[PDB]
């Protein structure tokens, strides 16, 4: 009730934590060649505003 | 570091050379001795003591190449220390002479349990 | 080691080079012959110290620990042949060669001359163990247990490399333990916590605390043919000894934060043996005994100042021989009844009388009956941590209470009768079944005569 | 930019509890505009409007963490014993994380938002306390 | 026989469309075992010029 | 002078939202060939007042590849319409 | 068709030599211009309508990634007019330089260049030819090296393995599983490039070897992970033992030689009092190993060889230079005291 | 009977003797080129 | 048939052997009608190497020397065991059709292999297209299921991509289903009582299913009578020889055609039909199960080591 629960709850949470976020990065990369390039432009502008990159 | 784009330059003459019966040169080609046995094992030979003419010339390959490779490895450390010791020899202000003090000077911590 | 590794690699092109079924007798013949040569140059003298040859050996001078590593390849081949002999000879030649390939790296380990030679050999294992876990088991929960055996051992051991390379270019070079005469102390800071903590935590993942023991009843429960790497995995757990090499020096003055490792591993000791008396899987019964009185060394290393190193060394090879044989008692008596359920094996002690002594003289070493190698080990630990604080006799005394009721519960389940079933279970414990069950107690009670061989520096 | 940190790490140091949490909601407020938002917005094309609001809508949800994240520190910096400490600034971790715990309901997120944020909270001010430098040169 | 559990379901749970392990989502396809030519639609009714009373 | 700001403002005929989007992909390949003459001119204004005497062969060679480049890219854009009849960049089958 | 297939294939490596043999930014423009001209036929050969709709997604990604480079040249043409390949004399140029060239090597931004091409090209045969295009711009970052902003080259590289790692646990198609962990092995080498830019090439020469030997193993039938089951008991059981050895080597385990780079590359990353930078990445490539374990749990445990089909005949493909690849890609960890004094 | 190709069987036996004698002459020279230089 | 790139740049194999002697011909027929009464009789005059129809032992009839190994290792559904047509079984009666299709495909993959190597015409008995005619009365008689019918229907669009069609394809003189007496009077003790649902249905399935290849550009030469017997023997000998070049091809579809210039119809079929292990390379089975086409992992996964004695018969040292 403890040795198989609250030691097994915290670290095999990490198995179910990364695979929750390994699904948001193939199923939101679903094609959309229109939407590759709208997202390259956000990356190219945010390098101008953010930090050291022009300095 | 001068005399650019050589495999190994002219000035490597005064290095020993790395003569044979060194265990690396035994080991270089020992993996080739293992590799020729694999070369039969991929193809359903089914020998594992197959044609020796394929099982030879792997030994000849690695040992010759690995010898001719190691002549610049011992060069590059020899040219490494050669430039460090010169910069040690000039600029004594960056290299002081420390004082020799025995254990009559130090009062260390002292932490017993 | 001048050449102990050099004959034991020559064992490897002998097995495949052999004939048919002679491959069992050819390997076990020559493997016993190293046990003279292992003893031979070693056990020399002896007063500061035996640096052995070169950058490859400090001879395992004050901690012998290595003769026991060389019994086992001529102990496991006679054990593994029970249910292995249905596969192909091409895979039967494999399972002997990787087992020798596990003994090769352990031989350059424990001696190792360095701290960075240690790690690359500390991690040179876990590849030939994992092959014995995944292939050659029983029904499933092998594969997740093959992954729980990783990712604890490997997640912890990578911050060693960050700290050991950090020492190698900070203070001289770590390459020798005898260039460790110049040691600057390590004070109380906010970076020197982590230098202590990352260098220590990768050893805790093998010899477990009460936390992070979650992989230990996974690999031992679901386990190869007849304890065949389970005998190896009990040595490998106590082959994480290197905290004795590190923490004696190399941040010597940090006891300030020992306390979350003391109380976690001193209260966990009194509980993780208590949590096993309701086990129903027999091989998981032993698997928690191996948690408890292994974790007594963790409060015996961090508490320094010997009369503990007298005992903390003797406890590493106390159940090196005991917990090996208990797995061999359970790798046998499973070939006949095909379950590891402890309920089912009743009606015994009439059918197999000759092995009744093998149950008791196993379980009489946990009761530990003071003239053995066991209560010469605990009673130095008891008289050590008494001098830390007097109150620690309570928890460690109740440790002695519950394991008395614990060991007999495995004995007394066989003293019943009428057997109700079982037209099988005929085999009257053949000549092999007693031979590999012997050579355990035969050195175990022998060394109790002059156990000055089993001592640290100290 | 880096000068925001040169007005964050320089002047207050525990005291002046309004300008501490006025500047420390600028940084965490700015990251709500970030790539996460960018990505989702682009991904769903939203609509002519309402859609836009909804998209940002969650960016507004995000804002709020850096509002309390000085405030939990600068209250508890002076009231106890008047340094700034690793145990001082630890307190801003959990309840600072619990904004993400309060919304998008807890019992599986919120305490895990509490626990791990408290780990990464104290190490930051511990960083300059030992003089840690991430992107360095010889 | 006895040795372990090499069951059938370990092939279909690894059954290759997208390896759903953290949710069922908008899966791609059952991708083609041969080389990839589903969309064969290339045809036109050619031009119908009358060179008549021109 | 201001003859460089216009034209460095005119280099933003890439602008990436209109470098692959939206459909009728010929509209996107248009500004790929029209991104030249913002490089062919921006080089030619610099080599010519500052008498380099030799680097002015480089604006001649700047066209010769980008013509052959875009001609290759226009070959494939027939092949997307040879299989369909419409280019329509919201064609997507091979996911990522 | 046969002779002209060499002349196309020959000029691919002739395009990348001029990238290396150059003292002049105009010639490095021509160098990997014509590579983007002479890859497009190799994409085609069997004319399938995914391949035509894949090279065109390949094409314009490497037209713009070309085109920003010539923009970066003409900026520092205005500033001091020297055209030798060296430091770029302008932070508005070098910023536009590095994150233009980050598309051809594709880093973690400029994302789907890597999976969307390599998946579903019916030429899975090779497509080992995508090791030249990882080799040409690395030969450009060896010179530009003492002029960068030191934040952008790390932020593209810290994101590199954190998102090249997560991306492929959700996969079956083993071309994508090779396409992923190809951004990750571009993450380890450009995290180091500001600090001692040699002991970067050590990681690259290892990466050519271990990846080239992975595709040659794959050229019996293998398409999908379920097809990676059905050749242990059918084709050759020695293939199953070999395909175990390279993966466990490419994960970085210290009994093999994919642990050769890291072991050396942390000798350089600390020694520069940067400790929190490697401890993030060294623990990040750990779930880059859960590709490989759970891939080795397919072939090496006899997982369901059903649908009885006998290959009663021998194999005659061309496994060229295969007998010497897993003898320098596994067993070299003892035999390299100085590979970094030959390559240095 | 035996039936090899009988063409290259010996080229492997002829390349090594070309390689080794080229190696040893390069080695027995360079063993003296140390003292000839030093 | 090409041998690598190096031989191919010196002498090509598209057309210097096929001097109109391609003439790739097959038959369709019905049971006991077009077996060898007409098919095997015409090898000469036209020089046509006959190939047999089918059987379990075709893989045993290659790779050697050469004697057929028994039905244990090639475990199929056993010609003259499936005549019990087990509508309720373990089973499986579909597992015959997998090995029926793969023994079919290797004949046609050696067919094209033989032509460009030599230049001879080849008569086949039943091509790869005949296998679906059985499935019509395999379906309506209750000894098959669906989700097995679709499987080879999915293989058919996968494995058949490069196959140039046959040329003067003969539907043999077939009766009005007099086969009920032909299956009895000609012996055949296990080919037995099973009624018109297997007789009439495949006969209706020769007409409406085989018609598109019969309406493909290669002209057919169809008979429907008792037999040839010197009435359709010479008439399908002489006037098919006039239909070999003259009345021969319309869209031409098979010529080793206009890419015969060391191009994709010259080598890239004659290099992908050599070494016939890449020809049944997509003959890999189901996703996982299919509930009929299976083999267990270690029993009968242990029926492989019995068929793997030394794994290659003879090769010795020193070579
Ligand atoms: C007809 C037959 C033919 C004729 C036969 C010959 C006539 C009889 C022989 C004469 C007597 C010798 C017998 C030896 C045993 C008694 C010795 C003795 O008491 O004096 C000590 C005496 C001491 O000699 P010392 O000159 O006074 O001092 C020298 C040392 O410095 C002293 O200090 P230390 O260094 O020795 O340290 C003490 C300690 C240290 O020794 C040990 O502890 C080693 C034992 C544990 C080893 C653990 C490491 C393993 C890893 O020794 C002991 O353990 C004593 C226990 C008894 C011997 C242990 C046997 C070892 C097994 O001898 C020994 O210690 C050596 C013992 C060697 C054993 C030989 C094996 C004999 C086996 C006979 C089998 C007979 C079976 C019959 C069947 C019966 C059926 C019912
Ligand atoms: C005309 C050029 C023809 C050769 C072109 C070769 C094509 C490029 C092949 C790329 C393979 C990657 C290898 C990179 C490491 C180079 C190997 C090496 O260390 O030896 C170079 C050696 C040593 O080079 P070096 O010491 O003279 O100076 C160059 C140093 N680097 C490479 C770091 C810039 O050069 C040779 O002499 C070649 C033999
Ligand atoms: C290192 C420098 C870069 C080398 C990487 C490989 C690039 C070579 C490009 C040509 C290779 C090729 O396409 O072959 C595939 C081709 C596939 O072509 P194909 O068979 O699919 O199509 C040809 C069709 N016919 C036959 C009809 C003409 O052949 C092979 O599969 C094997 C041939 C060679 C494979 C590559 C061998 C070299 C790779 C190891 C390099 C080791 C470097 C060590 C570094 C230290
Ligand atoms: C050597 C360099 C000089 C440049 C000449 C370039 C080719 C000029 C065209 C030559 C016309 C010759 C016509 C009659 C040839 C006899 C027909 C024949 O047997 O085929 C041989 C043919 C001559 O080619 P071909 O043009 O006559 O027709 C071959 C058909 N295609 C083009 C589809 C391959 O030789 C070859 O096929 C091998 C060469 C490959 C293609 C040529 C490009 C590379 C040239 C070699 C380098
Ligand atoms: C460690 C020391 C340094 C190692 C570098 C040594 C240089 C490379 C040495 C390996 C040479 C491999 C070789 O000789 O060919 C192997 C094999 C051909 O074997 P063969 O004797 O010709 O038998 C023919 C029977 N039909 O090959 C075959 O089976 C197919 C034939 C192709 C021949 C191989 C061509 C490559 C030879 C030049 C290698 C140079 C590039 C090195 C790449 C690998 C580097 C590790
Ligand atoms: C948690 C991550 C936090 C680690 C912070 C890094 C600590 C650090 O800065 O190192 C301190 C020190 C060297 O750093 P520095 O301050 O620059 O030394 C002065 C140089 N003149 O001294 C050191 O070199 C310490 C380097 C080794 C410690 C790195 C590993 C720390 C994390 C390991 C925690 C234990 C395992 C937990 C992870 C496993 C589970 C995921
Ligand atoms: C003695 C060689 C082995 C016995 C004869 C060969 C039998 C054989 O063909 O099995 C090869 C075996 C591969 O295992 P597997 O594929 O699963 O078995 C089915 C084989 N049809 O195993 C293999 O032999 C594959 C090759 C492995 C690498 C070579 C090891 C074989 C031992 C002979 C070389 C000994 C010298 C090298 C090792 C020295 C160690 C110090």
From Swiss-Prot, chain D:
This is NADH dehydrogenase [ubiquinone] 1 alpha subcomplex subunit 11. The keyword Transport applies. The modification N-acetylalanine is found at residue 1. Its main location: mitochondrion. GO terms for biological process: mitochondrial electron transport, NADH to ubiquinone. The gene is NDUFA11. The keyword S-adenosyl-L-methionine does not apply. Complex I is composed of 45 different subunits. Keywords: Acetylation, Electron transport, Membrane, Mitochondrion, Mitochondrion inner membrane, Respiratory chain, Transmembrane, Transmembrane helix, Transport. Belongs to the complex I NDUFA11 subunit family. It comes from the Eukaryota. One of its GO terms (cellular component) is mitochondrial inner membrane. InterPro entries: NDUFA11. It is found in: Mitochondrion inner membrane. It is a multi-pass membrane protein. PANTHER family: NADH DEHYDROGENASE [UBIQUINONE] 1 ALPHA SUBCOMPLEX SUBUNIT 11 (PTHR21382:SF1), NADH-UBIQUINONE OXIDOREDUCTASE SUBUNIT (PTHR21382). The chain crosses the membrane at residues 21-42, 57-79. It comes from Bos taurus. Accessory subunit of the mitochondrial membrane respiratory chain NADH dehydrogenase (Complex I), that is believed not to be involved in catalysis. Complex I functions in the transfer of electrons from NADH to the respiratory chain. The immediate electron acceptor for the enzyme is believed to be ubiquinone.
Swiss-Prot record, chain E:
It comes from the Eukaryota. It is found in: Mitochondrion inner membrane. The modification N6-acetyllysine is found at residue 29. Belongs to the complex I 49 kDa subunit family. Core subunit of respiratory chain NADH dehydrogenase (Complex I) which is composed of 45 different subunits. Component of the iron-sulfur (IP) fragment of the enzyme. Interacts with NDUFAF3. Interacts with NDUFAF7. Interacts with CERS2. Core subunit of the mitochondrial membrane respiratory chain NADH dehydrogenase (Complex I) which catalyzes electron transfer from NADH through the respiratory chain, using ubiquinone as an electron acceptor. Essential for the catalytic activity and assembly of complex I. Redox-sensitive, critical component of the oxygen-sensing pathway in the pulmonary vasculature which plays a key role in acute pulmonary oxygen-sensing and hypoxic pulmonary vasoconstriction. Plays an important role in carotid body sensing of hypoxia. This is NADH dehydrogenase [ubiquinone] iron-sulfur protein 2, mitochondrial.
Curated annotation (Swiss-Prot), chain F:
InterPro entries: NADH_UbQ_OxRdtase_chain4L/K (IPR001133), NUOK/Mnh_C1-like (IPR039428). The keyword Transport applies. It is found in: Mitochondrion inner membrane. It is a multi-pass membrane protein. GO terms for molecular function: NADH dehydrogenase (ubiquinone) activity. It catalyses: a ubiquinone + NADH + 5 H(+)(in) = a ubiquinol + NAD(+) + 4 H(+)(out). Its main location: mitochondrion. The keyword Ribosomal protein does not apply. Its EC number is 7.1.1.2. Core subunit of the mitochondrial membrane respiratory chain NADH dehydrogenase (Complex I) which catalyzes electron transfer from NADH through the respiratory chain, using ubiquinone as an electron acceptor. Part of the enzyme membrane arm which is embedded in the lipid bilayer and involved in proton translocation. Core subunit of respiratory chain NADH dehydrogenase (Complex I) which is composed of 45 different subunits. Belongs to the complex I subunit 4L family. This is NADH-ubiquinone oxidoreductase chain 4L. It comes from Bos taurus (Bovine). The lineage of its organism: Eukaryota, Metazoa, Chordata, Craniata, Vertebrata.
Swiss-Prot record, chain H:
Its main location: mitochondrion. It comes from Bos taurus (Bovine). Belongs to the complex I NDUFC1 subunit family. The chain crosses the membrane at residues 6-24. It is a single-pass membrane protein. Accessory subunit of the mitochondrial membrane respiratory chain NADH dehydrogenase (Complex I), that is believed not to be involved in catalysis. Complex I functions in the transfer of electrons from NADH to the respiratory chain. The immediate electron acceptor for the enzyme is believed to be ubiquinone. Complex I is composed of 45 different subunits. Keywords: Electron transport, Membrane, Mitochondrion, Mitochondrion inner membrane, Respiratory chain, Transit peptide, Transmembrane, Transmembrane helix, Transport. The gene is NDUFC1. GO terms for cellular component: mitochondrial inner membrane; mitochondrion; respiratory chain complex I. It is found in: Mitochondrion inner membrane. This is NADH dehydrogenase [ubiquinone] 1 subunit C1, mitochondrial.
